[PDB]
Amino acid sequence: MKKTKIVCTIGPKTESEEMLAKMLDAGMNVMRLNFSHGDYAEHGQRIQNLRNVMSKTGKTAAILLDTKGPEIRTMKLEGGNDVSLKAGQTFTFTTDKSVIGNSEMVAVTYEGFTTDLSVGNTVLVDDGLIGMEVTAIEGNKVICKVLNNGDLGENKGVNLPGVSIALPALAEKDKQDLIFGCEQGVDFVAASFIRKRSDVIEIREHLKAHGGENIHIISKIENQEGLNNFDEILEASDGIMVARGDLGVEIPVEEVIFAQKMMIEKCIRARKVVITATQMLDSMIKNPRPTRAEAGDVANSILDGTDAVMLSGESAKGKYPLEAVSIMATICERTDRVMNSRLERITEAVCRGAVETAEKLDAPLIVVATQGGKSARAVRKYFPDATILALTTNEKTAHQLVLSKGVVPQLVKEITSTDDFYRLGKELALQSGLAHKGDVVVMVSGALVPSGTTNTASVHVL
Amino acid sequence: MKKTKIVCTIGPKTESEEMLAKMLDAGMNVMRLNFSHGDYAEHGQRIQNLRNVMSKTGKTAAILLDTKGPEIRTMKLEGGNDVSLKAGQTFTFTTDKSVIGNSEMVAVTYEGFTTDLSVGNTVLVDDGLIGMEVTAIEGNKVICKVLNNGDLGENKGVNLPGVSIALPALAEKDKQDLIFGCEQGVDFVAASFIRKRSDVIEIREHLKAHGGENIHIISKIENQEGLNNFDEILEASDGIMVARGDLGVEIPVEEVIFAQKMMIEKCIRARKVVITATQMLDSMIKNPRPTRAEAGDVANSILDGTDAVMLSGESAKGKYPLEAVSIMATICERTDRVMNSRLERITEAVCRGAVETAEKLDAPLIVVATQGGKSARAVRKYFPDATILALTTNEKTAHQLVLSKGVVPQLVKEITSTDDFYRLGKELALQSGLAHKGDVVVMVSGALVPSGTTNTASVHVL
Amino acid sequence: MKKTKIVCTIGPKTESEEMLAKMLDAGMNVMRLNFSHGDYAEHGQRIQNLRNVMSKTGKTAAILLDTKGPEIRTMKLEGGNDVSLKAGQTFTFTTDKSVIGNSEMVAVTYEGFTTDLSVGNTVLVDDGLIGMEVTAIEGNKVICKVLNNGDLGENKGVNLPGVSIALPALAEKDKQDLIFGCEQGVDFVAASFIRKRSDVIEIREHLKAHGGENIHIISKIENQEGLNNFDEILEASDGIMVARGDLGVEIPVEEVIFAQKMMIEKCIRARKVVITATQMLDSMIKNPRPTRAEAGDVANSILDGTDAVMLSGESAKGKYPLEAVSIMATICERTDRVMNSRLERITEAVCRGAVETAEKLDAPLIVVATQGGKSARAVRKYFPDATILALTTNEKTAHQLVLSKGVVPQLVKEITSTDDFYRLGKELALQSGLAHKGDVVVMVSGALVPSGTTNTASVHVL
Amino acid sequence: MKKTKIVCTIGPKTESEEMLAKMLDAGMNVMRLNFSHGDYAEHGQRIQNLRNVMSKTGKTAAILLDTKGPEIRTMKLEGGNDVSLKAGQTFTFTTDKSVIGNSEMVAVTYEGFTTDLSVGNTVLVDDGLIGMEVTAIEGNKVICKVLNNGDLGENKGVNLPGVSIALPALAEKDKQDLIFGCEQGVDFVAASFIRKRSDVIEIREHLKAHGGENIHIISKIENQEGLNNFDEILEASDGIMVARGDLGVEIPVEEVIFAQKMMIEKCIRARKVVITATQMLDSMIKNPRPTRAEAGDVANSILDGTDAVMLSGESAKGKYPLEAVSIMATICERTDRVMNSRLERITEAVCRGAVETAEKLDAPLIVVATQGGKSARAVRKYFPDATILALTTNEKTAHQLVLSKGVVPQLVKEITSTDDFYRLGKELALQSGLAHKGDVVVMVSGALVPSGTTNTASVHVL
């Protein structure tokens, strides 16, 4: 019933085949492997468990590897004791990795800390808990004024709002994780902390060098620089993950909502998948139902037009993973059902016209022939009322279309001509149970053209 | 360049192969044979001459047989001299065909004259030259008061505005002429004086009894009864001829223009060809150029949306036939040049969408696969900017489509699948010279459906 | 209840008060005085006769003076009779007026003939019957080649398409006629022989020199130069007369149709009255009913959007003046009945919105306050379904609005404020019989602005 | 600035004249007095402080009294100690108000508890912390099975999802509080727990009986019954308060978002003010910045079209009231900045047209004459880009309009005619600084009609 797709982070509490089967039943479509945690054996077993469930059940799902990414962290403290920092005090960061910290100084993991920052910049420590102002930079030290009281622990994330950070596109561990991704045949790589087009290119070349040229890159937009370069990032990527939580400590709080809406809108126009993620139903880590605010947040992201919504801790380690997935699916179908098409060069003319024709003829189903998935994503751009049945001979395309809104992939032996596509599509339409005898279906394909163009629309009664 | 099609009545001045070739060059598309005059040997030779020119040139034209039709006429006069009738005098019509007339009485050819008229009806004689009011009907006589002075000659047409006249659908000569039409394999029959649906059916049954089931019937609308019954007449016909001159004697003069505009509009909606005829460029019977009034009348009929315009005496017996055709073509091109598409179940959705797609992509050509001509006529309904190349295996369809606005027919060997249609259509598009390498064409056909449906539209770069 | 206004040329057959009263009854709105004929006593009596009728009846009409203007004509020939000219022969025009002509030469009335013409120009003689090309100019001779066979008679009109002639818009006879017009207080001047903007200015300066500053200038577009300069002519004029017959003598016949349509459209956009004239119902000079062609031409001119249609000979010297007016009114009402509003600066925003509001609320009447007439004409531009009741204290404006489509003028003693306008307008609305208790009316005026702007729209229930 | 209006609950932390002045500076428009807490002397001094600031400063604000309302609560426990309830245990509610409760039974304050509930209904206790299922109803006892573990404290709210509760429209304290509201001349009453049209009518009659007929009633929609009867409730009320927090405990969580969006949309169409309230920036009770989720929730409520957003604890008792108002105003301006007009009977035709005219002419200001406020609210319905300057002689209207989106009220001594309105309105437009010389303004009023119809729009250049 629902069209919006659900990404579920799988962890210890949901990794068993029993759980994965019930997760798919409840509406999960894509497994997220979060490589900030776990080791290759845990993630590898999760992949095995899912593909076994898919084989036994005939269910289709996609697998997304989400990188840890490069980051700036504080380091160790004296006797590993927390230190209490006070508004107004001076506090210093050093790039000397040998230093053990105290209430006056701590080391950071990033040698470029002194170069990238300027006097007057803001330094945020521990997911924005403690704010500081840079007052001087001397040698390997960044000297600051603490702006608010807070307890500093060990190895805390550092955020530098509005700063262009010269960290590499990939941490060394990320590069090995991507090779693991290629070994395992993952369908998507979600790359963290993408700031510019060149970051995306480096990831693409790394995957290409290990046989992952057909893996789709989902760039995570987490700070102002990525927002500034969004158009070029999107062009080089296959999709976008809107990381609202990270944006919330990196840009003015009133900008975050319009950053999400703008990024979703541009992804739609580019025919590229977008995932809304972080801080979705987090209260369900501890509670069996979400808050009103969370449900509204999720629903507005769907009304914005997102292809997919993502569960993190709620599904990986929380106490009510199945409840979280089920209420997410309820939110999806309740919100999708009240959304309308948006019908306002060749592919788009044909795909937009195909959706218009389907709407005017009350067709419940658009059947699309596709090799790389573009024709299905081109139809989805207009938010058809009809479900999209996407026929492909490409197993990776079949998996990847699971993430696109309102698309049902079906792997087929092959499609040998335009008329054979019509014959086969009509029977698979009936077999799918998505349409019935007497229903109108619209059938969209590329005839006598290279694989990337969609140029033909045809109307059939089942 | 022009899209509006030209019907030319062929007579002694224009029947030679040499003249016919120059007429086609100047813009003639359809030959009208007016069986009000001539004998079978002359009309047969005209048919042969045109088919010879078509063979010699590779040009395609259609042949239309126009019946004389039933009439009411006055008859003979004393010493075959005209008689002067005076306003206010009594004048009498008799159905006794033996009577030789004079200034007080004349015979009419129609026995039902006394039956169909009522006291107070209007009798018009000789193209409305002389008007009379029925004052009494007794026996075989219709006694009238003459309303205006006029000279009555022999054998003059009679018009009875607003009266339902029980003349047969076909005169006995019409039946014979129609069989000749079937023997010769004409493409159209223009049936005179159609007043009701049953008139069309009688024509259809006659043609079908002599192997003319595939001849298209063009019903001529000439009086109020036909206008009252137009919707049923159009439904039973393949097309309509708007006979403006006859309507001008039969209905209130201010209604004629809107009768024309309404009939053209309804024909367009029905995907049925419409011809505007009579009083077009008649002054060119005697003059080498038309009047301003004539040129404007013609142009407004094209802006009304007519498929075709018709020359009568101007091309059959007039002194300047080639001039008349040439200026008609100049008017057509000049008017077609400034007309726009009209873009406002399955066949129409696909054909309307195909036209909109062509426009949005600046396609100079829509290529249509068609057996009966239906798909080509369905596209033309929306007045495409693009020319229509209609590919058919049916020679009769190829000829009949010559009358539809903006259609270039092309006879082909049969196309056995949709992809074969695209392959061949692209080649014939280039071969036609209507599109060139790099142009976009839209290709419309029926896939996996019976002959009555058009369900597939495809966009290709040549 | 037509909206299109009728201009009737008044002559001996129709100048008496009794005829004029019957003409107004039948639908005449404006009297045209053709100063091509008649003397000041005749025209003066016509003006008095109409003004007596308006006073006696309370009916409102306007008076339009139409100048003869200068002309170039050929002159006399050997003996009384014609000479036949042959295509290809050389033929010469001379500026020596003493010469009696023959098959090789004829004199013309314009001594500047040799100066204004150039080698290669086209000379047309006798309503374009015979065309010639200038091959040489020397002394008192313009040497040409005849382009087509034709018979040249005596004293025939000469046309020089697109050639700038150093003759005034008004000769001395024209200037005196216009002075008479100013003395008599005519409402409109229809100016002959307008070729360019400066011709209009000359008319305006002549009228302003004799107290005619409030007289509206209707520029006649009768030739090629005027068409080329139409935009500047329209801007300087108060309105336009489309003289189809004369324009047809000078430009390609297929262009005349679109010249008419383009000029009417531009006049509408400029909120300036336009009259369609010449060859309207000319056959009714001799016949009590018009031709089908004539009736359709008139109706299409109304659908084009003309404010007014004009009768010439039909009403001035013909046999059936009252019949011509009556059928003209029938054509107007029948065509106006099926026309729709066209809803596509401050005055434009308010007046367009007032019409849209009237349409949305089914108001039968828009009441406008106006001194110069601009607000009523600004509302009429959108072809409201509602009648326009224009209230003015200016008698000249009251007369002039009689020519604007769908406007009923009403002279009132005063309007002292916006609220008093609403009070009075509602009362006069009911008094007019154009609206009734419970009807909605839209009321348009200029508040706290100079007379040139319309800035206020108000909705009232009667 | 912003157009969305801010309601701030004023409490001990923010009641001083100094704090109120800084609140107005930061964007507060309406003071909410929450009569769940405080006494008449505190609220009375709150009113005095604000009115003194308004007088001294010339700043305008409104005062809204928010009732405590009728409630169902549990009562006391043994030794007033919490008791632990276990999933699966039996637990009983009694309507016997003498009973002191324990881990097996507690009293409720509402005698109708046994009557209104049915076997199988859900009872929720303490903001939905503990759910129970009714298994039996016997005498004064509702016997339930506890559905989840939780500690029950003293005097906790009870919610009965989907039940029609026969509590009175007003608690007895509410009736007294409303008399105080009338005594104090408050501008709005927000009435809690409105379930049906008759509840509103009772409130309306109670205000009318104490001189408060001009106080606007804002009905709070908090449960399913009120949602079911919303259309009748809105019709009888002056506005709506969307109590999201309460709805979250009373209806399926996935419905809450659409309940808000639907109620806002219907209020917009009804030209009636709507406030989005509860769970807006609650985290700012303790933190100086809001969460990303909260800012997005607020912004989406503004994009939904709410007139006003409300602060509760954040501004009444929290630690950072000025910060909360300031970031709220920042969110408002940021969101209002990207919203567009919505241009899709007489008042509505004129006001919709006035907004379209203003937009087409780039007018920064629509000036409205209004006595009851309807014309200002009718213009705001279309979300004009322009500010609305509302001129009124009615002091109560001036204050009430402070709550309507994008309206700036201005009290004037009088306006005696339409022309005087234009003159005065133009000067006050300039005086306000909302427009400047050369700007276009649109001026909207009712001319020659009673209060309550807006029928006049006028365009002026300043």
Q: Measured between alpha carbons, how far is residue A421 from residues A406, A442, A444, B175 in Å? A: 21, 12, 9, 51
Residues of A within 8 A of B440 (CB-CB) are: 346
Say how far apart CA D165 and CA D223 lie, in whole Å.
10
What angle is formed at CA B75 by the lines to CA B71 and CA B78, rounded to 5 degrees?
A: 170
Resolution (A): 2.1
Tell me the residues of chain A between 314 and 353 that have a Cβ less than 8 Å away from chain D. Answer: 327, 330-331, 334-335, 338
Q: Report DSSP letters for A300-361, one per residue.
A: HHHHHT-SEEEESHHHHTSS-HHHHHHHHHHHHHHHHTT-------HHHHHHHHHHHHHHHT
Q: Measured between alpha carbons, how far is residue C395 from residues A336, C5, C289, C399, C406 in Å? A: 67, 19, 36, 6, 18
Nearest CA in chain A to D249: A292
Say how far apart CA C394 and CA C411 lie, in whole Å.
7
Say how far apart CA A240 and CA A220 lie, in whole Å.
6
Residue B127 to chain C, least CA–CA distance (Å): 12
What angle is formed at CA B22 by the lines to CA B19 and CA B24, rounded to 5 degrees?
A: 110
**Partner residues linked to B8 by β-bridges:** B31, B311
Residues 6 or more apart from A420 whose CB is under 8 A from it?
Answer: none
Question: Is the separation of the CB atoms in A347 and B360 below 8 Å?
Answer: no
- Cβ contact, residue pair C459, D356, below 8 Å: no
Q: Give the active site residue among B278, B330, B357, B418.
A: B278
Residue D356 to chain C, least CA–CA distance (Å): 9
**CATH number for position A104:** 2.40.33.10
Residue among D228, D418, B156 at smallest CA distance from C456? D418
Please check whether residue D460 touches C, CB under 8 A: yes
Say how far apart CA C192 and CA C174 lie, in whole Å.
9
SS3 content of chain A, % helix, strand, coil (to 5): 40, 25, 40
Q: Give the active site residue among D3, D220, D271, D381.
A: D220
C-alpha Rg value of chain A to the nearest Å: 24
Tokens linked to B166: 């029980």
Phi, psi for D325 (deg, rounded to 5) = -65, -40
Residues 6 or more apart from A214 whose CB is under 8 A from it?
Answer: A396
Nearest CA in chain B to A416: B419
Amino acid letter for position A180: F
Q: Which of A124, A149, A254, A333 to mutate to test the interface with D (most CBs of D within 10 A)?
A: A254
Phi, psi for A146 (deg, rounded to 5) = -75, 130
Say how far apart CA B456 and CA A353 lie, in whole Å.
12
Residue among B181, B184, B178, B203 at smallest CA distance from B193? B203
Q: Which structural domain range is residue A95 located in?
A: 72-159
Amino acid letter for position D134: V
Treating both helix axes as pointing N-terminal to C-terminal, what angle do A292-304 and A256-270 enclose, rounded to 10 degrees? 40
Say how far apart CA C201 and CA C192 lie, in whole Å.
13
Question: Is the separation of the CB atoms in D130 and D152 below 8 Å?
Answer: yes
Interface C-D: count of C-beta contacts within 8 A: 75
Sheet of A158-159, strands arranged across: A105-107, A90-94, A141-146, A130-138, A122-125, A158-159
> Distance between terminal CA atoms of chain C?
21
Residue among A112, A115, A219, A232 at smallest CA distance from A169? A219
User: Which helix (H) or strand (E) element contains residue B299?
Assistant: helix B292-304
Can you tell me which residue has the tokens 């709150």? D46
Question: Is the separation of the CB atoms in B174 and B69 below 8 Å?
Answer: yes
Question: Is the separation of the CB atoms in C17 and C52 below 8 Å?
Answer: yes
**Partner residues linked to B65 by β-bridges:** B33, B189
Tokens linked to C240: 């336009």
Question: Is the separation of the CB atoms in C63 and C186 below 8 Å?
Answer: yes
Q: 3-class SS at B311?
A: strand
Treating both helix axes as pointing N-terminal to C-terminal, what angle do C253-269 and C292-304 enclose, rounded to 10 degrees? 40
Residues of C within 8 A of D422 (CB-CB) are: 447-448
Q: Report DSSP letters for C140-170, one per residue.
A: TEEEEEE-S-EEE-SS-BEE-TT----S-SS
SS3 content of chain D, % helix, strand, coil (to 5): 40, 25, 35
Phi, psi for C105 (deg, rounded to 5) = -160, 150
The pairing of beta strand C456-461 with beta strand D456-461: antiparallel
Say how far apart CA A406 and CA D72 lie, in whole Å.
45
Treating both helix axes as pointing N-terminal to C-terminal, what angle do C40-57 and C17-26 enclose, rounded to 10 degrees? 60
- Which residues of C are catalytic, by number? 32, 73, 220, 278
Say how far apart CA B446 and CA B437 lie, in whole Å.
26
What angle is formed at CA D74 by the lines to CA D71 and CA D78, rounded to 5 degrees?
A: 155
* CA D342 to chain CA mean position, Å: 23
Question: Is the separation of the CB atoms in C155 and C139 below 8 Å?
Answer: no
Q: Give the active site residue among B5, B32, B195, B380.
A: B32
Can you tell me which residue has the tokens 């009294």? D65
> Distance between terminal CA atoms of chain A?
21
Residues 6 or more apart from B73 whose CB is under 8 A from it?
Answer: B108, B109, B155, B156, B157, B158
Tokens linked to D302: 């503004």
Instruction: Measure CB to CB from residue B458 to each of A345, A419, A447 and give the nearest one.
Output: A447
CA C295, C296, C301, C307 dihedral sign is: positive
The pairing of beta strand D308-311 with beta strand D239-243: unpaired
Question: Is the separation of the CB atoms in D268 and D274 below 8 Å?
Answer: yes
Q: Report DSSP letters for A364-420, one per residue.
A: SEEEEE-SSSHHHHHHHTT--SSEEEEEES-HHHHHHGGGSTTEEEEE-S---SHHH
Name the experiment that determined this structure.
Answer: X-ray
Instruction: Measure CB to CB from residue A248 to each of D292, D297, D327 and give the nearest one.
Output: D292
Q: Report DSSP letters for C160-203, one per residue.
A: -TT----S-SS-HHHHHHHHHHHHHT-SEEEESS--SHHHHHHH
Residues of C within 8 A of B258 (CB-CB) are: 299, 334, 338
Say how far apart CA C293 and CA C290 lie, in whole Å.
8
Say how far apart CA C31 and CA C315 lie, in whole Å.
10
